[PDB]
């Protein structure tokens, strides 16, 4: 449609009106989790707030994070995910799935979702980074193996694209 100004438009305004209403950490965690499944990664639900999601997300991150410092006890901020899950458990879990992945297309989804679900402030910074890092090495290895094997035509179909035009 018609675009509005980059850094100030009705969309970021409205989501901010929304974020403002969150009050519980539980509350804030579902919200941000729903927000990232719906709007981030090429496997996003919607592409509607495409040019505004990243700013909005950051604003939600802020709300969640502030909430945690004033509600969860200090220890939890270090030892666990906002979901009440034990940070190491989550790490153990996802590093297990990725290792169990049988294809690159299977590997990518595990990595992409881990982020949507656990990007800080949901998961502690130190925990998220190493896990993200560990998942990343696997995906890369699964992927860079025989990289030029499949022809373009084949790749197009494995990706499941709707080829609208070839010159």
């Amino acid at each position: 449609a018609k675009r509005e100004p980059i850094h100030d438009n009705s969309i970021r305004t409205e989501w901010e009106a929304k974020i403002a209403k969150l009050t519980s950490v539980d509350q804030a965690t579902k919200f941000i989790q729903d927000f990232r499944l719906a709007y981030t990664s090429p496997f996003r639900k919607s592409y509607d707030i495409d040019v505004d999601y990243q700013y909005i997300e950051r604003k939600i991150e802020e709300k969640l994070s502030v909430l945690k410092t004033e509600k969860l006890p200090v220890a939890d901020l270090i030892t666990k995910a906002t979901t009440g899950e034990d940070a190491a458990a989550v790490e153990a879990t996802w590093i297990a799935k990725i290792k169990a992945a049988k294809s690159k297309y299977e590997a990518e989804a595990i990595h992409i979702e881990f982020r949507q679900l656990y990007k800080p402030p949901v998961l502690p910074v130190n925990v998220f980074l190493r896990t993200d890092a560990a998942l990343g090495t696997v995906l890369m290895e699964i992927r860079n193996t025989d990289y030029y094997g499949t022809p373009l035509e084949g790749l197009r179909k494995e990706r499941g694209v709707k080829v609208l035009h070839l010159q």
Binding site: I6, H7, T40, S41, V51, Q54, Y55, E57, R58, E61, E62, S65, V66, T69, E70, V74, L77, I78, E108, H111, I112, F114, R115, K119, P120, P121, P124, V125, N126, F128, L129, R130, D132, L135, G136, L139, M140, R143
Partner: protein, 383 residues
């Protein structure tokens, strides 16, 4: 055939140039918000060099990056730290150091040090240092310590790649180079000694073994490995290493141990080196203080938020260093008991000083409650 000095070309360019300026704003990046009274050159050449987008507090660009890591980790992102802020650019190093001023200064230190060394050897001033201090303490435990500095230097690699602003970046990098310098300089004194006192083994074999297996440096090696490899939150690495670990144990080891006791065992060589490490410390301090106290701990919107993590990290890492110190005070057992320096009380005031400054230098600025008395007692137990 250059256009400036070639008749036919200079003439041609002369005709193309307009008689008047096409704008009067001549301040390079005039839109930078000055910290001081008017825009500095340090600011003008540093501020906004990092292409951050609006979704990262402070940045002026827009859109997503053009290439992320596999899985989507952003080139730079808010996942790198738990600390939040109104503008990541807010940071200003009190020294206004950009690359030029920084190497210029060190270059002075570089050359002066070699002049001083050539004279000192011609001076034969080595003749009166205490042989035990020289051979047993200096050569071994002072050598060992280079590994503490080297460790801290290394805990900056990821910081260097992960921080969210240019100024912090430079503050971070000049910090790292100063630490590898300390390491390099401690060895330089060791090598100079070898050239002067025959049989003095300046190699790192013994100081290396001591670091990794000698109980005196046990807690330190513990803290260091944890700061270096333990975490990736770039603010946590910066805080814990400089504001806590070095401010305490490092400062105690350098100023209170080696430099102080050097001026009691008649050692006129070591204070020359410690002068540099101690100056370097104070310089990083101003930068570290601005970033954490001014910028972070006092961010209008996230002060209390960041302080939660600051006080958290502080309680964790201070405990680690109290232990580091407790292991360190075992070294006193190997020195001559000078009445009032290497004795219980002497050593106790050394601690008093350390914990006492840290309390006004860092603690009180961030709202961390510390009972200096208790911490001295704590360290002293391993005496």
């Amino acid at each position: 055939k250059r256009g400036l000095t070639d008749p036919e070309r200079a003439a041609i360019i002369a005709a193309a140039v307009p008689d008047h300026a096409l704008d009067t704003q001549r301040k390079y990046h005039y839109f930078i918000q000055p910290r001081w009274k008017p825009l500095s050159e340090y600011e003008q050449l540093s501020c906004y060099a990092q292409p951050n987008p609006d979704w990262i507090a402070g940045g002026l660009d827009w859109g997503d990056w053009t290439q992320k890591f596999h899985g989507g980790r952003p080139s730079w992102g808010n996942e790198s730290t738990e600390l939040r802020t109104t503008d990541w650019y807010r940071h200003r190093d009190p020294a206004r150091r950009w690359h030029h001023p920084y190497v210029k200064d060190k270059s002075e230190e570089a050359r002066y040090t070699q002049r001083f060394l050539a004279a000192y050897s011609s001076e034969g001033s080595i003749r009166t240092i205490d042989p035990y201090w020289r051979d047993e303490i200096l050569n071994k435990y002072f050598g060992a310590l280079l590994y503490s500095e080297y460790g801290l230097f290394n805990a900056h690699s990821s910081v260097g790649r992960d921080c969210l602003s240019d100024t912090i970046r430079q503050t971070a990098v000049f910090a790292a180079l100063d630490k590898v310098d300390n390491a390099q300089m401690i060895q330089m004194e060791r090598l100079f000694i070898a050239k002067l006192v025959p049989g003095f083994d300046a190699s790192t074999d013994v100081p290396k073994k001591i670091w990794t297996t000698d109980p005196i440096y046990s807690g330190a090696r513990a803290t260091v490995q944890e700061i270096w490899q333990g975490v990736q939150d770039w603010n946590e690495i910066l805080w814990a290493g400089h504001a806590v670990y070095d401010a305490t144990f490092g400062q105690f080891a350098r100023r209170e141990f080696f430099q102080r006791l050097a001026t009691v065992y008649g050692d006129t060589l070591t204070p020359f080196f410690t002068a540099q490490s101690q100056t370097y410390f104070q310089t990083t301090r101003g930068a570290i203080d601005d970033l954490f106290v001014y910028c972070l701990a006092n961010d209008s919107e996230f002060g209390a938020h960041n302080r939660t993590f600051l006080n958290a990290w502080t309680e964790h890492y201070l405990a680690s260093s109290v232990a580091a110190l407790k292991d360190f005070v075992g070294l006193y057992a190997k020195v001559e008991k000078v009445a009032g320096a290497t004795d219980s009380a002497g050593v106790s005031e050394a601690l008093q000083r350390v914990f006492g400054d840290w309390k006004i230098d860092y603690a009180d600025k961030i709202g961390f409650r510390v009972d200096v008395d208790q911490k001295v007692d704590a360290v002293l137990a391993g005496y």
